Amino acid sequence: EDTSGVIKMAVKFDAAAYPAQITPKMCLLEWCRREKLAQPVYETVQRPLDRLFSSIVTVAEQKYQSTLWDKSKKLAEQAAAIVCLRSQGLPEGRLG
Ligand SMILES: C[As](C)(=O)[O-]
Ligand SMILES: [Cl-]
DSSP: OOSSSEEEOOOOOOOGGSSOOOOOHHHHHHHHHHHTOOOOOEEEEEEGTTTEEEEEEEEEEEEEEEEBBSSHHHHHHHHHHOOOHTTTTTOOOOOO
């Protein structure tokens, strides 16, 4: 119904919570592929004066983003993928 604006959650990617190879970005890409959706599109947001990074991910016309800032583009993108999965109640590829 409504796919406008941005959906947010307070999330930060913790690599220790995930198996050696799988990441939230990979889980989200696979979910899109299984659902026959366009692959996720990531756009970086920066606060250069603080060396901070955020990412807004678009999946099925909806924007998702963490409320929190990260130390790199890569880390911000994993956070954005977590928001996308978690807000939808989807499995995130965690250990437990
Ligand atoms: C994917 As970008 C060009 O917003 O870092
Ligand atoms: Cl999970």
